Every structure is written in C-alpha cells, then in structure tokens.
C-alpha cells in the first residue's frame, strides 16, 4: 500500500473530486447567478493539482513526463468543456432546456473527476517505476457517492 501522508498530488486529487461533488450537490437548487462560483472552485482545485504535478515532473524520466503531461492537458480540456456547459445552462435558466443543460454540466464535471483519478494513476506509476514512491479506497468512495 502507498503512504499518502506527504502526498500532495493525492490530496489535491481528493480536493478536486470533493469540489466536483459539491457542484453536484448544489446544482439542483442553484439560480443561474450561482453557477460561476461552483465551476470556479473546481478550476481552483485543478490549479492546485497541476501545480503540484508540475513540481514533480522534473524528477521523473522523460517517458513518464510526456504521458503525465498528456493527462494534465486532458484535464484542461475537461474544464474548458464544463465551462461551456455552464454557460449553456445559464442561458437556458428560463427555458425548458434548463434541466438538460444541467444534466450536461454534471456529465462534464463527472468526466473531470474520472480523469483526475487517471492522472493520479499515471503519477503513482511514474513514481513507483522511478523508485520515488513510499509504501504504507477513499478516492473511489468519493467517486462512488458521485456515481449515484
């Protein structure tokens, strides 16, 4: 098992998934005016994550570095897309497309969480195989409560 106490990437991924889960929990009752803050808090935890990953990359071999950068780029694309579904939903607050728009917000935010986990995995592999990891379900639990 992996020791997560000092592990800023793991902790930042957990915070990301928690912000996505807060978006989901607030969405149904939120007025359109309140959509910006909950997507921004997701993006803020992505900024922290990418920050802690960046700090790590120069210690990894070029192989791992490239593939980790692939995962980060995807996360950014995921946020860009959540921002797009957020705007659609705002513009449809007073139409009968509001519910569908919000469903598509949730899909986009869920996709982001899933890929945050996938970044965690590629980081762990890169550490493991570069003798950088430290040995000794919660992440998946958050994803499960979200999957509902």
């Amino acid at each position: 098992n992996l020791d997560r106490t000092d592990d800023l990437v793991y902790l930042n991924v957990m915070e990301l998934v928690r912000a996505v889960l807060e978006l989901k929990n607030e969405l149904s009752q939120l007025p359109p005016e309140g959509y910006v803050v909950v997507v921004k808090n997701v993006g803020l935890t992505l900024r922290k994550l990418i920050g802690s990953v960046d700090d790590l990359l120069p210690s990894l071999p070029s192989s791992s570095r490239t593939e980790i950068e692939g995962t980060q780029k995807l996360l950014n694309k995921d946020l860009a897309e959540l921002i797009n579904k957020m705007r659609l939903a705002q513009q449809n607050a007073v139409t009968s497309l509001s519910e569908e728009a919000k469903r598509q917000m949730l899909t986009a935010s869920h996709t982001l969480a899933v890929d945050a986990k996938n970044l965690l995995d590629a980081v762990d592999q890169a550490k493991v195989l570069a003798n950088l990891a430290h040995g000794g379900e919660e992440l998946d639990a958050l994803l499960e409560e979200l999957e509902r």
């Binding site: 910006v36 803050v37 997507v39 921004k40 993006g43 803020l44 992505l46 900024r47 990418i50 920050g51 990953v53 960046d54 990359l57 950068e69 980060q72 780029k73 950014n76 946020l79 860009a80 921002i83």
Partner: peptide, 19 residues
Amino acid sequence: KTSAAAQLDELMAHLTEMQ
C-alpha cells in the same frame, strides 16, 4: 508556468471575468 499551468490560467481568467 509550464504549458498546462498557462493553459489553465487562461481558462480561470475567463471564469473570473463573468461573475
């Protein structure tokens, strides 16, 4: 300030301008 951090700051700058 890699490409990912720069691309992300770009996305975040948009959200902040529409609150």
